[PDB]
């Protein structure tokens, strides 16, 4: 279903879900089914060849590209709507949360980003906001919600040529936040803040990190590594014992993590 004279013949647009192109909550008039439609003005003029590739591939942990419509002046990417809820909301509400839970989340993100990297796509915008649950179910998978300061790799902030390794840094930062509930870099000045990011200066500070395993800390260090050449790839991280083995702990750390999430990501 490529061609439309007017997209409103197809969809009832309801709520804006994000702008940057715009993403709108939409209902297919013929079926009543809901989607997230990314509206892209044609003015932003390779792209059609790439969309044509991903339209045929469904990854368990990535929002699906379900359909594409073309109007006289716009391109519409009809995306799977993810209704399970936000990542942090779930953790705070759960009342019980362990390293195993964080590891399970990261494992899925690694799977998704590995696939994207294999397809030649660098995400460049990995953050907790882009991670959504498929369903309200207890066992719901997590999914990357969309794809094209504190989460950005040093080589990017340094205006250096960068690669897929920048996503791996972002995964490290997300893993850091999942284990303590606050970001690894923060300061009132942007001078030292950027400098701290540029120098990759972070700490597993007490008391927050006292009950976290050495294995988890090692895992994060391999991803939050200043040198993109030394930085773990997604493949390498997925082989780390914290992900692939049994070193993720089973201690309930919900109290501190949720308290920090509420404080820092209110």
Swiss-Prot record:
Widely expressed. Highly and mostly expressed in polymorphonuclear leukocytes (neutrophilic and eosinophilic granulocytes) while little or no expression is observed in monocytes and lymphocytes. One of its GO terms (cellular component) is nucleus. It is found in: Cytoplasm; Nucleus. The modification Phosphoserine is found at residue 103. Induction: Expression increases upon treatment of EC cells with DMSO and retinoic acid. Induced by KCL in PC12 cells. One of its GO terms (biological process) is positive regulation of CREB transcription factor activity. GO terms for molecular function: ATP binding; calcium/calmodulin-dependent protein kinase activity; calmodulin binding; protein serine kinase activity. Residues 11-243 form the Protein kinase domain. The active site is at residue 125. It comes from the Eukaryota. Keywords: Allosteric enzyme, ATP-binding, Calcium, Calmodulin-binding, Cytoplasm, Inflammatory response, Isopeptide bond, Kinase, Neurogenesis, Nucleotide-binding, Nucleus, Phosphoprotein, Serine/threonine-protein kinase, Transferase, Ubl conjugation. ATP binds at residues 17-23, 38. Its EC number is 2.7.11.17. There is a cross-link at residue 94 (Glycyl lysine isopeptide (Lys-Gly) (interchain with G-Cter in SUMO2)). The autoinhibitory domain overlaps with the calmodulin binding region and interacts in the inactive folded state with the catalytic domain as a pseudosubstrate. Belongs to the protein kinase superfamily. CAMK Ser/Thr protein kinase family. CaMK subfamily. This is Calcium/calmodulin-dependent protein kinase type 1D. The lineage of its organism: Eukaryota, Metazoa, Chordata, Craniata, Vertebrata. The gene is CAMK1D. The chain holds residues 13 to 302 of 385 of the full protein.
């Amino acid at each position: 279903k490529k061609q439309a004279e007017d997209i409103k013949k197809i969809f009832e647009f309801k709520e804006t879900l994000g702008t940057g192109s715009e993403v709108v909550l939409a209902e297919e008039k013929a079926t009543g089914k809901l989607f997230a439609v990314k509206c892209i003005p044609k003015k932003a003029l390779s792209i059609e060849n790439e969309i044509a590739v991903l339209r045929k591939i469904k990854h368990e942990n990535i929002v699906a590209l379900e359909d594409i419509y073309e109007s006289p002046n716009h391109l519409y990417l009809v995306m799977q709507l993810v209704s399970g809820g936000e990542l942090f909301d779930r953790i705070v509400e759960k009342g019980f949360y362990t390293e195993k839970d964080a590891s399970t989340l990261i494992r899925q993100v690694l799977d998704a980003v590995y696939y994207l990297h294999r397809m030649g796509i660098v995400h460049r915008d990995l953050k907790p906001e882009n991670l959504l649950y498929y369903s309200q179910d207890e066992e719901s998978k997590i999914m990357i919600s969309d794809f094209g300061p504190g989460y950005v790799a040093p080589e990017v902030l340094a205006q250096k040529p960068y690669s897929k390794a920048v996503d791996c840094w972002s995964i490290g930062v997300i893993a850091y936040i999942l284990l303590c509930g606050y970001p690894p870099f923060y300061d009132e000045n942007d001078s030292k803040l950027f400098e701290q990011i540029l120098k990759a200066e972070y700490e597993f500070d007490s008391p927050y990190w006292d009950d976290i395993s050495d294995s988890a800390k090692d895992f994060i260090r391999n991803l939050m590594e200043k040198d993109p050449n030394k930085r773990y790839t997604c493949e390498q991280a997925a082989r780390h014992p914290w992900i692939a083995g049994d070193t993720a702990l089973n201690k309930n750390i919900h109290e501190s993590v949720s308290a920090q999430i509420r404080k820092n990501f209110a």
